[PDB]
Amino acid sequence: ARVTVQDAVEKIGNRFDLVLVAARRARQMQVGGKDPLVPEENDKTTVIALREIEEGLINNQILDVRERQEQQEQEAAELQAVTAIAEGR
Amino acid sequence: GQNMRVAFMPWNGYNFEDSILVSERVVQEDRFTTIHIQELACVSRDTKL
Amino acid sequence: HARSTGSYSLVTQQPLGGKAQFGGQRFGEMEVWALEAYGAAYTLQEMLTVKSDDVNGRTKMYKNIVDGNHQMEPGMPESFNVLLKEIRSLGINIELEDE
Amino acid sequence: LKAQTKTEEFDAIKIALASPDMIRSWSFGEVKKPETINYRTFKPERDGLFCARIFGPVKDYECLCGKYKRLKHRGVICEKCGVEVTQTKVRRERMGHIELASPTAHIWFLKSLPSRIGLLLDMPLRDIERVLYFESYVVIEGGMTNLERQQILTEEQYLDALEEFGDEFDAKMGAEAIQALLKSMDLEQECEQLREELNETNSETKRKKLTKRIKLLEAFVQSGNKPEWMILTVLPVLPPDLRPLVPLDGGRFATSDLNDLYRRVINRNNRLKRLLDLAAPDIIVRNEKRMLQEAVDALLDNGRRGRAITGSNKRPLKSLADMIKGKQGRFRQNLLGKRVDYSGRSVITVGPYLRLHQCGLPKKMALELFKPFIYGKLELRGLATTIKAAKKMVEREEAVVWDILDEVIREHPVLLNRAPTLHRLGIQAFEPVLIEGKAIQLHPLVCAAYNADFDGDQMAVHVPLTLEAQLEARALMMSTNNILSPANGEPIIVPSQDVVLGLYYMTRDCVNAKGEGMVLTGPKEAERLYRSGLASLHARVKVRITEYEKDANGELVAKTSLKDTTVGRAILWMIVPKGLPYSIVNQALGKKAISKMLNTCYRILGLKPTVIFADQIMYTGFAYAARSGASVGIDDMVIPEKKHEIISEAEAEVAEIQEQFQSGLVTAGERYNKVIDIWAAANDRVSKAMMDNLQTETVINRDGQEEKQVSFNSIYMMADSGARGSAAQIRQLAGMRGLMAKPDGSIIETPITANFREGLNVLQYFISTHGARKGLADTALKTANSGYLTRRLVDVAQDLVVTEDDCGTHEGIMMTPVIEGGDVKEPLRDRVLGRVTAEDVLKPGTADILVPRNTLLHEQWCDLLEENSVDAVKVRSVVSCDTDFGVCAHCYGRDLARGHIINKGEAIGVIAAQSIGEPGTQLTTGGLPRVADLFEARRPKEPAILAEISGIVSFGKETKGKRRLVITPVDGSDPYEEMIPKWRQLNVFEGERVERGDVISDGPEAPHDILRLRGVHAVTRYIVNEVQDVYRLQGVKINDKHIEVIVRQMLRKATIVNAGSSDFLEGEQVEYSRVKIANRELEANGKVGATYSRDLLGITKASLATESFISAASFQETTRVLTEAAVAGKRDELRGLKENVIVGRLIPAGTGYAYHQDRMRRRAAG
Amino acid sequence: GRTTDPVRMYMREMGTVELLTREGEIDIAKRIEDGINQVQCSVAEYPEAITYLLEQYDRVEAEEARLSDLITGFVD
Amino acid sequence: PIGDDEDSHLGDFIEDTTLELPLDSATTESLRAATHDVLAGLTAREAKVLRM
Ligand SMILES: [Mg+2]
Ligand SMILES: [Zn+2]
Ligand SMILES: [Zn+2]
């Protein structure tokens, strides 16, 4: 369990945005699109996300970057799919 | 009610505010036990069905 | 007393015990202020929308809770929704602007 | 990009008058009949208050006649009776209307205090009503003949006038007349003419009313509402499901009161149409029209005419206005309260075994609470086939479900709450620990935050459903994350009673005991010495200890030494973490000291070590207090041996003064004062007798004959440590208790001679009873007073939230120690702590900057300022903040549950009000009503008058009611002469110069004055100092900040002096004004900038003004607010807390601040 | 004068009109007779009013209507 | 108004019996998965005939 979030509050200053970011990440884990970045102790996604914040390997910057990259990861897949839609003309 | 042996002394904070720490001797002797009589009702009504 | 999902009041949809299965605790103005003092917006929203007053949000929530997804799709509380009709029932036109 | 048509996520809201065609737009049919249901088959009669055609199908996706019963046929209108088969919920949605035969006035616009139809037409109310009742004729569009436009005539007068002028003259009566008035009204022309008339004549009485009225007019014009709409052509009907006919047990029906009303309206209306088609005489149709007016009025808002009663029941029927308003003063459901799912509650118990980050929860409770989670998790692993079977499993309570519950409980926090919620700590988050029993276990250290005793107090539990709520609870509402009261940086986790008696009993020294004067290597063998029974817990002993100091740079220094201390202190030292010096535990450890221990530990080691430290302190406190064997006997309370003697002597004094009254040496009242004085002095004597005795009387021998120390007596240790009891109560146990006072307040001259250890007889007890009853009554009253105060406070602040980061102003208030009377009622260090310097400060010598510019002053900065002699620091405050529509974090301070600077987006107004309001139960002109008076800015009863302007003054004129005072400035003119009643003893010297704001008389002064004459900083200083004078005298710690934000909200409004944009005398937001003048100093007009004057509005007054009308409808009078907004067509954009709470979306603060921001900028932009 | 509560503003407004004498009733009734019979006679002096009645009775014997929807009966 | 003189009024206690419980609503959604998988079990034409 995570008794105090002070360390996470150290990694990202705002402390509300801590809740938001850790939330978003915890969601990334809870509805599984992804896996933890650090060993799961049986800790629920709620705490795993916080452990990820405390280790400084997860925050708003990192998440935004990863997501932005994944958009192009899908664009690459559907590259030949959507260009086949030239029937639009 | 019922009288009984009482000792005044803090016991491991289990008595903390007004809280009362009672032995098993009491629950075993069934002295503070109470009997409740509840009246439950069943109604047979008339519906258009 | 403990309650998860019970019956609901007809006139305004709100948790109400009909079975001797008790209506949930009442979350008042002061408790709301207590939430406002902290930074918890979502706790408050879920408190007065999905857990109580939203006829949609409650069930749509329940399905997610059992599905293993914790989220909410809040919508508009039925209270305010009724207030709109009561106000509009008078000579007062109340509308919701923009987008 | 096509904007949109259908449903989006809506912003703001709009409110205005309703058009007949608009009313029809909502209406999906006209209700033509008073009938409800068929009386046998309960189906709705077509075209009635309850109807399938107009409103909706009775049962889900089914036609009324029953032809199309299939879920397939949906958008189908049935041929038999048109009913589109759709969900029954639509019968809760679709509205209706009624076409009224004769025109009808809307009672909300007739009877609202500033009658709208009245002042819009510039016509008196009584006239308009006299016209509505057909009591007299009124003119419309008189033209040029003999008569005015708004003029009123009578029967004979109308007849004669008509006989003289057939046409080019017009008069009607009834509702049609008022409608004709409003419709013929041309607002623009009135605007032009009124502007001219405003400009021509010079009189105050004239142009005041003139400008007020033109402003009103043009406002109503810009609204988009046309006056005709004040008169109802069409009457909308509320959906049937919102006024249900739903049946009950025993075949009995129950329906709302709106049906009686609506039915009445329909009836009388139809009967009116009937009487029209029958060509009835005038009198009849007039009576019918009036009756229709009454019915409609009673429907809309009942009680403003006759108070109509419901069928067969005396109690007046509830109208739509009452439906909206609600009850319990002003409570609109999002206020009074709302029932919530996933919750519970029960009696609470102790649970000392708990860590402070957790708490006990009953098994069954947790089962029923987490039930959905339990289902989903049960079938996720595969223990249950389907959700049904899962329910069957948890219903049977199979052995396998308990483990699954242990799974879903683990990292999932729960919210705990108490009944009297005041400060934010009233609700706190904990980690659930499954416990066998029906009782909730609550960690002892938190029992202070809730103000919860163990005497049967109940707590309630809520489950943080959504993920965001889990993380919100864990990172904010969590217990460990708030260790400090938001009011002041002092720890609220301070040990309570048993624990402090434990730590007190531990570290203390009796003169002689086992192992006296020996030496030990370390705390380990000290404890080992104690437990074995070789050494006593309290003995003076030298032992070697290793203490750490982190005084190096981010680094712990280690040093060892032989400390002269006691066995108990040595044992306790094991707990004290790291860099804390041994000195802290080398004392007697009172409640105050044991608190300062935790404090220092937090300001040194940080959060986590403070948490674990506190936990350990609780555990050891309980353990050693248990071992201590502390108890209370009847002999533990020691009465002075000299008591009876003091009693007898003081009793001789009374017969001395009595004999003097017998001989007439003294008067009656003076005698009374004398005897009361001697008895009081007696009580003091016995008190300070028993105190000395009970305190130091222990006389014990070490190696010599005798010596004496502070007593080891139980009740003393209890009172001295601060565990419980106090000199006041101990005084009542041993020595005599006080003198009592009859309800009148006249204090009886025969005090209570006996005490509780002794017996009280009949009289003494009877006399005490009144004191008791007045005690309970007064306290129970002051709870309510506190509540009301907090309410006014949150209402006046609320939406104030930290928004911008830094406004960057050098502005601030001068922070000095309070220095009242004799020495230092409060230091400088506390006043400036956790705040930020407006500008850099100096040493005695300069070009050496200790604290640069704006920096947070923490313990090190404040002690660095304490090292130096600096007596003066200018500090940034929330009252002087340059940021408009909010406070910048750089202005506020660091104060919070955490030592770091205040976060961006935290809502400070709320927490400020809560902080001011929580101690309010502990407050005793002076007192709590004094505080209420202060925040209300009420002018006192017998105030003082400050000098208007500096310079030499003299006494003008003579005696009529006042003797005029003539002021004479040095350079400028001297028109200023104030009329001061001469029957009030003056102060000001007839021959001396008086600075503006000097004392021209005595008594308290209204803060309006202090603001105007002495300045803004001056008045805020007066308020904060006076209210702090009230609290501090009671022993209440409240930081100046909260009071200062309340103050900022008080002065939010100001009245303009100069011009060039808006009106002259308008009171308006200094935010709006300052933003407009700062914008007008450059560009625009080169400089047209207008001067204002800061205004002081009381809290309850400043609460009145809120942009959002939905917010105003909450705590104010709903009926007026809705109208008064609806006329101007006011558009509520939300943006505040209360409004967003009502509408049910994320709060524009806290976590939601990242939302409303990313929105607010998207709005009014690209 | 106006106490509101229309029970009054009615009760008083009607109380103005004085009760009829036993003869005045006959006067008024006579006036009624005069008016009515006037309009009846005016109806009898219209050719289309006659021809219409005829065209209607031609539909009465033709089973397109009934004798009840045309006349309530004659002076018989 | 019922007892206590409070805002408790008769209609406030009238429960909605016309609504459906969520505990059943989750089963109604779950059955649609069950019959779907089970229909995926039979032959395509048996599945067509049964779904029809
Ligand atoms: Mg209590
Ligand atoms: Zn039909
Ligand atoms: Zn500022």
Question: Quick check: D139 and D333 in contact, CB under 8 A?
Answer: no
Q: How far from D459 is each of D354, D447, D484, CA to CA, in Å? A: 17, 11, 22
Given its phi and psi angles, is residue C17 left (phi above 0), alpha (psi -120 to 50 degrees) or beta? beta
> Rounded to whole angstroms, how far apart are CA atoms D651 and D675?
9
Q: Which residues of C touch D242 (CB under 8 A)?
A: 11, 82, 85-86
> Rounded to whole angstroms, how far apart are CA atoms D556 and D435?
42
D359 in a labelled binding site: no
Return the half-sphere exposure (C-beta side, CA atoms, 13 A cut-off) of residue D812. Answer: 27
Q: Which residues of D touch B9 (CB under 8 A)?
A: 626, 629-631
Distance (Å) from CA C32 to ligand 3 centroid: 27
Closest-CA distance, D1055 to chain E, in angstroms, reads 42
Q: Which residues of A touch D478 (CB under 8 A)?
A: 4-5
Question: Quick check: D1093 and D1055 in contact, CB under 8 A?
Answer: yes
Distance (Å) from CA D77 to ligand 2 centroid: 8
Neighbours of ion ligand 3 (CB under 5 A): D 807, 881, 883, 888, 891
The residue in chain F having the minimum alpha-carbon distance to the alpha carbon of residue C55 is: F19
SS3 of D470-537:
HHHHHHHHECCCCCECCCCCCECCCCCCHHHHHHHHHCCCCCCCCCCCCEECCHHHHHHHHHCCCCCC
DSSP type of residue D700 = -
Looking at residue A54, which CATH number applies to its domain? 3.90.940.10
> Rounded to whole angstroms, how far apart are CA atoms D1054 and D898?
36
For chain D, say whether B24 makes contact (Cβ under 8 Å): no
> Rounded to whole angstroms, how far apart are CA atoms D1028 and D1035?
10
H or E element in which residue D153 lies: strand D152-153
Question: Quick check: D981 and D964 in contact, CB under 8 A?
Answer: no
- Residues with Cβ within 8 Å of residue D919, at least 6 apart in sequence: D487, D1031, D1034, D1036, D1038
Q: Which residues of C touch A15 (CB under 8 A)?
A: 39
The residue in chain B having the minimum alpha-carbon distance to the alpha carbon of residue D724 is: B17
> Rounded to whole angstroms, how far apart are CA atoms D889 and C36?
18
Strand partners, D95: D27
Closest-CA distance, D242 to chain C, in angstroms, reads 6
In this structure, what token pair is assigned to residue D1042?
Answer: 């909260």
Owner of token pair 């004959």 = D705
Are D326 and F7 within 8 A, CB to CB?
yes
Secondary structure of residue D930 in the 3-state scheme = helix
Secondary structure of residue D780 in the 3-state scheme = helix
Strand partners, D558: D548
Please provide the distance, in angstroms rounded to a whole number, between the alpha carbons at the two ends of chain D: 13
Owner of token pair 């004799």 = D822
Are B18 and D623 within 8 A, CB to CB?
no
Please provide the distance, in angstroms rounded to a whole number, between the alpha carbons at the two ends of chain C: 43
Owner of token pair 């004999």 = D659
For chain D, say whether C25 makes contact (Cβ under 8 Å): yes
> Rounded to whole angstroms, how far apart are CA atoms D704 and F46?
109
Question: Quick check: D43 and D58 in contact, CB under 8 A?
Answer: yes
The residue in chain F having the minimum alpha-carbon distance to the alpha carbon of residue D88 is: F18
CATH number of D634-782: 1.10.132.30
DSSP D243-257: S---B-GGG-B---S
For chain B, say whether D481 makes contact (Cβ under 8 Å): no
Q: How far from D734 is each of C39, D34, D485, D684, D899, CA to CA, in Å? A: 51, 79, 36, 13, 45
Question: Quick check: D413 and D378 in contact, CB under 8 A?
Answer: no
Kindly identify the ligand whose nearest atom is closest to the C-alpha of D450.
1
D457 in a labelled binding site: yes
Burial category of D623 from C-beta neighbours within 10 Å (exposed 0-12, middle 13-18, buried 19 and up): middle
Long-range residue pairs from E56-59, CB within 8 A, at least 24 positions apart, any chain: none
For chain E, say whether D305 makes contact (Cβ under 8 Å): yes
Closest-CA distance, A31 to chain C, in angstroms, reads 6
Closest-CA distance, D497 to chain B, in angstroms, reads 8
For chain F, say whether D634 makes contact (Cβ under 8 Å): no
- Name the amino acid, one letter, at D822: G
Pick from D546, D730, D742, D711: nearest CA to D637: D730
F and A touching (3 or more beta-carbon pairs closer than 8 Å): no
Owner of token pair 């041929």 = D79
Pick from D251, D229, D226, D216: nearest CA to D122: D216
H or E element in which residue D626 lies: helix D607-628
Pick from D878, D881, D877, D773: nearest CA to D832: D877
Residue D992's CB is within 10 A of a number of other CB atoms, namely 9
- Name the amino acid, one letter, at E23: E
> Rounded to whole angstroms, how far apart are CA atoms B1 and B21?
17
Range of the domain at A82: 1-89
D799 in a labelled binding site: no
Q: Which residues of C touch F16 (CB under 8 A)?
A: 7-10, 13
What values do phi and psi take at D1162, rounded to 5?
-60, -35
F and D touching (3 or more beta-carbon pairs closer than 8 Å): yes
DSSP D381-393: HTSSSSHHHHHHH
Domain D1099-1165 bears CATH identifier 1.10.150.390: yes
Measure CA D193 to chain center.
Answer: 48
User: Can you give the residue ranges of every domain in chain C?
Assistant: 14-99
Q: Which of D256, D336, D387 is facing F11, going by the closest CB pair?
A: D256
- Residues with Cβ within 8 Å of residue D810, at least 6 apart in sequence: D838, D839
In this structure, what token pair is assigned to residue D980?
Answer: 């001061």
Find the DSSP H helices in F1-52: 22-41, 44-51
> Rounded to whole angstroms, how far apart are CA atoms D622 and D503?
9
Task: Note the residue count of chain D.
Answer: 1166
The widest CA-to-CA distance across chain F, in whole angstroms, is 67
> Rounded to whole angstroms, how far apart are CA atoms F3 and D289?
40
Find the DSSP H helices in D314-369: 320-325, 363-369
Question: Quick check: D835 and D824 in contact, CB under 8 A?
Answer: no
The residue in chain D having the minimum alpha-carbon distance to the alpha carbon of residue C58 is: D341
Q: How far from D105 is each of D183, D383, D397, F49, CA to CA, in Å? A: 14, 68, 64, 66
Are C93 and D472 within 8 A, CB to CB?
no
What values do phi and psi take at D837, rounded to 5?
-70, 135
- Residues with Cβ within 8 Å of residue D142, at least 6 apart in sequence: D148, D149, D151, D169, D170
Find the DSSP H helices in D81-225: 107-111, 116-120, 125-132, 155-164, 175-184, 187-200, 204-223
The residue in chain C having the minimum alpha-carbon distance to the alpha carbon of residue F25 is: C59
D453 in a labelled binding site: yes
Are F22 and C11 within 8 A, CB to CB?
no
Given its phi and psi angles, is residue D848 left (phi above 0), alpha (psi -120 to 50 degrees) or beta? beta
For chain D, say whether F7 makes contact (Cβ under 8 Å): yes
SS3 of D5-38:
CCCCCCCCEEEEECCHHHHHHHEEEECCECCCEC
D447 in a labelled binding site: no
Pick from D90, D333, D322: nearest CA to D1144: D333
Secondary structure of residue D937 in the 3-state scheme = coil
D601 in a labelled binding site: no
Owner of token pair 């189906």 = D43
SS3 of D790-843:
HHHHHHHCCCCCECCCCCCCCCCEEECCCCCCCCCCCCHHHHHCCCEECCCCCC
- Residues with Cβ within 8 Å of residue D474, at least 6 apart in sequence: A2, A5, A46, A47, A50, D413, D429
H or E element in which residue D1055 lies: strand D1053-1056
Closest-CA distance, B8 to chain D, in angstroms, reads 5
Strand partners, D157: none
Secondary structure of residue D977 in the 3-state scheme = strand
- Residues with Cβ within 8 Å of residue D742, at least 6 apart in sequence: D748, D770
Distance (Å) from CA D780 to ligand 1 centroid: 13
- Which stretches does DSSP call E strand in C1-99? 2-3, 26-27, 92-95
* Helix count and strand count (H, E) for chain B: 1, 0
Technique used by the depositors: X-ray
Return the half-sphere exposure (C-beta side, CA atoms, 13 A cut-off) of residue D572. Answer: 37
Q: How many domains does chain A divide into?
A: 1
- Residues with Cβ within 8 Å of residue D899, at least 6 apart in sequence: D484, D489, D602, D603, D858
Closest-CA distance, C32 to chain D, in angstroms, reads 9
Question: Quick check: A2 and A50 in contact, CB under 8 A?
Answer: yes
